[PDB]
């Protein structure tokens with residue numbers, strides 16, 4: 001169960017890395033090159049991480065439960081790249097882009113603290129990390145989306161789709177966590193491993209696909 | 223004593239974060255947005271750090287003394303943001319800005335090594351970190367200030383005030399350290415906790431105030 | 445043996461830091477300032493690292509062998525600066541520069557995992573890190589060199605020399621590793637310490653010299 005989905009994550013993220021790799025090598029202009037290059041490293045960072053977890057690295061029993069703490073070094077490096085996708089397609093302001101990366105790092109560090117601390121101390125840091133996530137939710141739903149649509153007037157549904165898909169996918173991460181043994185213990189590690197694996201595929205490979213087709217939409221409108 | 227000042231640091235840095243938060247949301251132009259956004263994350267990074275120390279996280283007895291090593295992850299992330307304040311208002315050269323951030327990181331890493339090593343080994347790394355600090359002192363007192371005044375001819379006292387306040391506040395940090403149990407043991411942890419707390423408020427909330435009024439001075443001169 | 449070469453590395457990297465330090469202070473224009481500043485921090489990062497290893501810090505027996513794991517925090521911070529040298533002289537595209545730094549960090553993290561893991565698990569992460577290095581080899585031998593020569597038409601041998609010297613020097617690092625106790629145990633720690641020390645001098649002090657004379661060549665061609 002756990003080992004199966006770890007290897008599935010390796011192969012899918014590897015397969016993803018090859019796809020974005022060749023797109024970067026055969027890139028149209030520089031904007032396509034940047035977009036293929038970002039998504040490539042998002043998947044390669046994920047592919048090596050799942051390689052480490054599949055080989056039993058980065059997992060240690062904490063509070064009496066096998067915990068893959070190394071997932072947080074994946075996300076700390078890959079999730080800012082995923083947000084750069086949004087700000088790159090959107091041509092976002094420097095202070096608003098910095099706020100998204102800063103808020104993301106805050107959410108992940110405090111999430112790590114919640115992950116490695118026992119109950120009920122972890123519940124405090126869970127609320128701190130969710131509050132940081134709800135801040136990103138506002139930043140993407142209001143100032144980021146509004147600024148991006150004004151800069152891309154005849155392609156507004158694209159940025160509405162971008163924000164929504166990112167929001168619905170990322171919202172499941174704190175739901176899996178609080179339902180995992182980290183919270184109410186509704187399911188065990190095997191189900192937790194499959195959830196994160198398929199989420200990661202959706203939010204990296206899947207969202208990588210959505211960003212490429214978004215650049216196409218913004219460019220076919222010119 | 224120690225717990226009181228830890229919570230005071232939480233509340234003040236939280237109160238600071240709200241102030242810079244609303245200024246960023248209601249920002250004048252982009253330069254005010256960047257300045258409010260920087261100082262917001264400086265305080266939010268500090269607010270979560272004091273939240274962790276107040277909850278007993280990030281403190282471990284080393285060399286026979288309770289040591290808040292996690293203070294160094296605060297400073298490593300927040301102090302470069304404080305220096306960006308100076309370089310942003312100053313419109314500093316890229317190589318001089320990089321030198322300030324590079325020298326700052328050097329000072330903090332070697333300071334961490336001095337913090338977590340026993341005497342007299344720590345004294346070596348203290349001298350290494352102070353030497354890096356004296357390098358920043360030169361960079362801010364001579365090339366940074368000179369370049370900034372030339373770019374802002376009718377607002378030279380502002381940059382003189384900026385450099386001086388930053389220098390006098392940051393100079394107290396190595397003084398508290400060497401007087402703390404890390405050095406001559408002139409005072410205990412409770413006094414050490416109050417010093418760093420009020421220093422952090424001065425150098426983050428206080429210096430955040432000074433940077434906003436500096437941008438106002440530079441802009442009212444146009 | 446080990447202690448002698450550690451102190452030699454301290455003094456040489458210190459002597460290097462002074463040379464690039466004064467060149468930065470007396471810099472011609474900003475491009476010379478950036479180049480002197482980069483190489484200065486490359487050597488200063490190396491000088492403090494060798495200071496820590498010479499003082500016995502950052503070395504711990506793993507898998508039954510004294511391992512200087514702290515070498516990897518040197519390289520993780522200094523090697524991207526060395527690659528910036530190449531991209532700065534070359535005026536490289538943003539996506540190609542990001543790919544070089546991303547691939548470099550990948551190689552070093554997975555190399556660290558190979559360093560701190562036992563055999564034969566380490567052999568997997570060695571192959572993963574070498575594959576990342578061979579990717580950088582392609583990036584520097586084909587797209588980086590081609591793009592740089594087009595931007596500098598009458599100075600093509602300079603970029604051929606830059607890429608070659610970087611490639612031949614960096615290729616020896618995985619050779620020393622696999623021949624060290626980390627691999628076939630062909631030599632002991634003393635010889636391993638001398639190799640890395642003289643490699644670091646070549647790839648930081650030596651390559652710093654080559655980059656300055658390269659900027660001179662590119663500029664005397666104008």
Ligand SMILES: *C/C=C(C)/C=C/C=C(C)/C=C/C1=C(C)CCCC1(C)C
Nearest residue numbers: 075111129130133170173174177203
């Ligand atoms: C590719 C990996 C991705 C997109 C990871 C995203 C992770 C999150 C959105 C984390 C969410 C969490 C919270 C907001 C609550 C605390 C627990 C976390 C860290 C799972």
Ligand SMILES: *C/C=C(C)/C=C/C=C(C)/C=C/C1=C(C)CCCC1(C)C
Nearest residue numbers: 297333351352355392395396399425
């Ligand atoms: C908001 C936090 C700030 C502004 C922290 C500043 C910290 C320093 C200036 C550190 C100074 C130190 C030395 C220069 C000597 C070694 C001990 C240190 C790290 C306290």
Ligand SMILES: *C/C=C(C)/C=C/C=C(C)/C=C/C1=C(C)CCCC1(C)C
Nearest residue numbers: 519555573574577614617618621647
């Ligand atoms: C100044 C330090 C430098 C230039 C270090 C360079 C290090 C490498 C090129 C590392 C190479 C390695 C491999 C590619 C295989 C795995 C073992 C390593 C990390 C030594």
Ligand SMILES: CCCCCCCCO[C@@H]1O[C@H](CO)[C@@H](O)[C@H](O)[C@H]1O
Nearest residue numbers: 080084087088091092093094097101
């Ligand atoms: C993860 C390491 C990078 C952190 C700093 C990112 C700086 C981003 O900078 C911003 O990027 C946007 C597109 O990404 C552009 O639209 C903005 O003009 C630019 O200012």
Ligand SMILES: CCCCCCCCO[C@@H]1O[C@H](CO)[C@@H](O)[C@H](O)[C@H]1O
Nearest residue numbers: 302306309310313314315316319323
């Ligand atoms: C902490 C992560 C950021 C590190 C890299 C900072 C790069 C700064 O870059 C510099 O910024 C200055 C203002 O800040 C500008 O005046 C300069 O033109 C710009 O080159």
Ligand SMILES: CCCCCCCCO[C@@H]1O[C@H](CO)[C@@H](O)[C@H](O)[C@H]1O
Nearest residue numbers: 524528531532535536537538541545
């Ligand atoms: C190690 C911290 C910095 C990582 C981000 C580096 C961003 C580099 O950015 C690139 O730099 C090149 C020269 O270096 C320039 O030729 C490119 O125009 C520029 O886009």
